[PDB]
Symmetry: C3
Subunit: 257 residues, 3 copies
């Protein structure tokens, strides 16, 4: 059948139609797996965890584990994963902490590559790519279409804006605004993901307004308040520029410069 | 307690309270002490001693041979203390004869996902190795040391008591006790003042250490000039002696 | 017997007579293992894949999985491993893509340490060392005797020259010429692997010629074509200098400086 007899399914666990579990996989108590989701061999799922439809989870992944501690501490804490996600070999995903959200949240159509770490209370949106060995410390918010290149380290509470790009080996300590490309340890803003805008079919008017929006924030010596005021008009014409202005507005503890 | 789908070698030695998850291998000459929980999918190889009330998580390879070419199959050891947590996919290699033929881990150590503890490494107590920390080999980590995620330590380096390394740090030279280091290559920034307050250090002892840092790092002295300047502060404050002693035992230089 | 009864051997799998396979290992369809090869417990082998003779593959390794790269669409691509290779704990090796030569290729006597990654369409030669957590993004050519120390990151299409050395935590966006020593993120050219050359028994005359060849490429203000021209004489005299000159000539992303 679809359920390999060498897998251990806890009596409390809930499996929907067309679910596959490979051999020697543990689907622990309070884990719920959605329609057509494929669990490979040698996977550990721990709950309380909700996984949606048409997901693929590869061998050696630990999905819904507790955040590391010298002692067991703080539950019920949730992990929620949406639909059409690919979680590759040996990925670690921790559930939330009772102190903060009490939930780690992953949306839809995300690709999390081998040995990536998703820390407690982190929130991933849709259509994101975390390349090999990307580590989100915890309480990290990754917005839609963001790409973290291989071995990107993100500090606790940092926001990764929509359509942003972090070069491989980047260590991020401050918010990355929407569309911004960052590199190095510590991470420095370089340009914008113009490549990614074109692959999203952004009007060349929107891309040119986003180029000027970069220069307003990074290049003209403005305060953030002065920048937000200078962007207000562009943000009103282009929803794309508003995503950018909003990412800067939301950064209380400062942006990656 | 011992899951029937685990392979326990005849010559393994497990206390009554020990839990072994399914699909785990307790290899030849593996001692495991009372209260220790071995998760599923764990490979333990010997000769290895594991103390008490330890927790080893799935996909961990504890007590394998180093691939370091200078190792040639000698019966070298791995000792682990008590109340240690070893997380998902941690690799801990046994020692080599060229040193002391032992990798040593003490008590109350938190070793997070995919950390590497190379051959002959000595970790003390209440240490934190965050995800993907790599100790290349012969690395001595002293009590209360914290190495942040993806911290790389070159062979033979000493990580001082209460020292802290920023994430993605690459350490080539000894880190003195209490010192904070960041970047590739690693550079001294300040003292672990949080760590001192964690331990309940006197505001005297913290002020003495704040000064001691300036003597070594900020006053354009040499190491020899600096050691002599500290010797009185060191004699008065056992806390300052830990710092001064870590600089003296640094024969291959300190992280500046 | 040598195949553990808890192992899963696909009917279509071809194992030489003395092949060992540890418990809860998977030898999938169209996987060939040559004589002497030992597979440890908890190993996943997917095909189409050819593993040669006297190889050792450690636990938690995923050898021959599909690349998550979005351009691969389930085409029947290959992985080929030669003889006398050691693959340590948790290594990932993906098969090729039809956009290149539909093959990922490893030669002989290579040491690939724990959690190292070998991306689609990568070509490793002989006597290479990939230290812990080294990652080749894809289409990476590593020539014979190349050392990549721990957590070395290699961008797609980068060529790592013969007897080259990359320091711990290096991030390589451009070709590493043969013999050259690189460090840092981004990677920086800092002289040549003279201790490597003296160890493998290179002549004093050859080492002295490589020393001058280095000055011509890096220290004489020459553009690459001006340099390739000046090396032409010395490359005709010494094979080592030809390998060096050849590595520079075949740089598609430029060279590490
Ligand atoms: O194209 C890109 N270039 C880039 N990275 N950093 N700076 N520039 C990124 C990175 N990659 S990748 O190189 O193929 C890759 C895959 C596995 C492992 C790694 C490694 F670990 F970094 F080595 C890299 C995947 C990817 C997928 C969609 C969009 C952009 C990218
Ligand atoms: O604060 C700290 N390191 C720091 N700060 N600035 N530079 N490096 C360390 C690190 N953390 S962490 O960020 O929550 C964490 C957890 C898992 C993975 C990672 C990652 F892999 F680095 F991304 C980070 C866990 C932790 C727990 C008690 C004491 C100190 C620490
Ligand atoms: O000797 C060397 N020195 C050097 N590397 N980078 N800069 N200097 C390299 C690196 N080493 S290693 O330190 O013993 C080692 C082993 C496992 C893990 C690591 C770590 F992950 F980086 F921490 C390091 C293993 C090794 C083996 C053959 C040839 C050269 C090397």
């Amino acid at each position: 059948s679809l359920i390999d007899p060498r897998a251990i399914i806890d009596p409390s666990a809930r499996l929907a139609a067309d679910v596959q579990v490979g051999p020697w996989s543990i689907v622990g108590a309070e884990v719920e797996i959605g329609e057509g989701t494929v669990i490979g061999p040698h996977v550990v799922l721990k709950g309380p965890t909700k996984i949606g439809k048409h997901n693929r989870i590869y061998q050696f992944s630990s999905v819904g584990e507790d955040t590391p501690d010298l002692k067991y501490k703080g539950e019920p804490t949730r992990l929620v994963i949406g639909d059409h996600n690919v979680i590759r070999e040996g990925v670690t995903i921790h559930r939330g902490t009772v102190q903060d959200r009490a939930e780690t949240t992953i949306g839809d159509h995300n690709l999390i590559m081998a040995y990536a770490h998703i820390g407690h209370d982190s929130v991933i949106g849709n259509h994101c790519i975390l390349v090999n060995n990307t580590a989100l410390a915890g309480h990290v918010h990754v917005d839609d279409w963001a790409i973290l290149s291989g071995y990107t380290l993100v500090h606790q509470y940092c926001r990764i804006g929509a359509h942003s790009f972090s070069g491989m080996g980047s260590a991020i300590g401050k918010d990355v605004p929407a569309y911004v490309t960052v590199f190095g340890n510590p991470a420095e803003a370089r340009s914008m993901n113009f490549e990614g805008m074109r692959r999203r079919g952004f009007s060349s008017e929107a891309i040119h307004a986003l180029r000027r929006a970069y220069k307003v924030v990074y290049r003209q010596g403005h305060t953030v308040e002065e920048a937000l005021a200078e962007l207000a008009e562009s943000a009103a014409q282009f929803p794309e520029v508003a995503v950018f202005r909003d990412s800067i507005q939301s950064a209380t503890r400062g942006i990656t410069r």
